[PDB]
Design a protein around this ligand. Structure first.
Ligand SMILES: C[S@@+](CC[C@H](N)C(=O)[O-])C[C@H]1O[C@@H](n2cnc3c(N)ncnc32)[C@H](O)[C@@H]1O
Ligand SMILES: C[S@@+](CC[C@H](N)C(=O)[O-])C[C@H]1O[C@@H](n2cnc3c(N)ncnc32)[C@H](O)[C@@H]1O
Ligand SMILES: [Mg+2]
Lengths: 239, 234
């Protein structure tokens, strides 16, 4: 017997709303941006939920990372969440994006909310830009093209972009269920099914790939749309 | 926009198995303990899952808490998970339990597992023993009587049992879904429904009450059977 509660769609949404009601909310400015994004780019099926926003903020407040990297800025929603949760450390927040339209939206939003002091938007395909980064990050949020996750994590590990005390959080690992199997998301809108099916195939390869890497500890948590947590294994204790 | 994937029972179990397959497993000795518990005890449904085991070990390896407190030892599974995730720091692990049977079972398992005295089982009702504890804990795992979670957390916060950079993790806050509403767990067996429905009403009051406390940051995470994360506000 497993670790996941079975809910139908309606009930899952009610439990989601209950979580939002009984968790501290995201700031008003972030709600403003969230509603703006959803309206301006309708049914894109891309931005994180309000509760995920709360989770991001809580996580940064808790962990107090010195530097944050995220891959896949979109409209800047998660970037703003990381910003909110790191006001005390004034962490640098590096975010990568390739879409010209979403770059413009994110720059506009970053200017509106005055977060330019430590949010740095790096433009271009992350396959090109990620490897150009220097130093290390205490928290890395991977939330871009699902077919690219393996390549991104590989660069992150091989170039030491993940700090000794850090964590990588990879989003949407379940691909709505389709990472696990073709029959695991019967509720899914058929119009997005082939997209998520392709993502699931890549993410299944990704997930199996991580289990072969002796350098890291790995946990796939069944929360939201699946979140893989990655850290370096403990350093050598004795000579 | 929802934050929870809908799964039927069979599919949820399959996705659980997938997570287990693609997460580092718990140590063989802890697998052994888990199986032993499932075999020897009729009420072994009280014990955390294997995947929850990996999550506990990972969380401890990650955060490296120096002192861990858990409420609700049962057979010692989660205590041994915390133990395994803190071999590098030799973190102290304090675990509260009131059942005479499970106290004996846990001491036997701890002795057999070969843990040292950094694992401390404190016997008695937690309402009484929690108050006697001194110092602070970097990670607190609340996993005992659901009707008492509010009191436990209040005591923890009032007495400063939670360190400034610590986290409280409260388990099973959804009560299989019945915390949210009486119709949210149609798959539950009739004979356990009164138990979970009672827990659900208590946990709902608990969840609401946390939102009234100006001292803490609160996140109710929709993972496993619901995990409430609590920290001191900065
Ligand atoms: C799911 S959205 C991220 C949403 C955002 N992190 C949030 O929480 O609201 C994925 C983003 O990654 C971007 N993206 C996809 N492939 C990319 C690539 N190869 N390089 C850089 N960005 C990419 C997309 O344009 C999109 O904005
Ligand atoms: C859900 S089990 C804990 C399982 C364990 N943490 C694990 O992960 O395997 C709850 C335990 O709390 C104990 N318990 C219930 N009420 C208690 C109380 N008021 N004081 C101390 N222990 C209590 C029960 O005897 C039971 O062993
Ligand atoms: Mg830390």
């Amino acid at each position: 017997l497993g670790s996941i509660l079975p809910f139908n769609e309606e009930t899952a949404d009610r439990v989601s709303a209950y979580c939002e009601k009984n968790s501290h909310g995201i700031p008003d400015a972030l709600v403003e941006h969230w509603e703006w994004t959803r309206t301006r780019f309708p049914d894109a099926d891309k931005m994180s939920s309000r509760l995920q926003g709360s989770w991001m903020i809580f996580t940064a407040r808790d962990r107090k990372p010195k530097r944050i990297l995220e891959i896949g800025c979109y409209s800047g929603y998660s970037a703003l969440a990381w910003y909110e949760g790191t006001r005390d450390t004034k962490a640098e927040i590096v975010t990568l994006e390739y879409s010209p339209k979403m770059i413009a939206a994110s720059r506009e939003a970053f200017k509106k909310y005055g977060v330019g002091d430590r949010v740095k938007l790096i433009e271009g395909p992350a396959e090109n830009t990620l490897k150009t980064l220097e130093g290390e990050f205490d928290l890395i949020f991977v939330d871009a093209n699902k077919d690219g996750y393996a390549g991104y994590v590989k660069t992150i590990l091989d170039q030491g972009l993940l700090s000794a005390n850090g964590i990588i959080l990879c989003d949407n690992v379940f691909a709505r269920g389709l990472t696990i199997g073709p029959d695991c998301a019967p509720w899914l809108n058929d119009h997005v099914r082939p997209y998520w099916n392709g993502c699931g195939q890549a993410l299944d390869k990704f997930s199996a790939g991580l289990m072969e890497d002796p350098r890291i500890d790995v946990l796939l948590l069944p929360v939201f749309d699946g979140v893989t947590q990655i850290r370096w294994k403990d350093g050598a204790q004795r000579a």
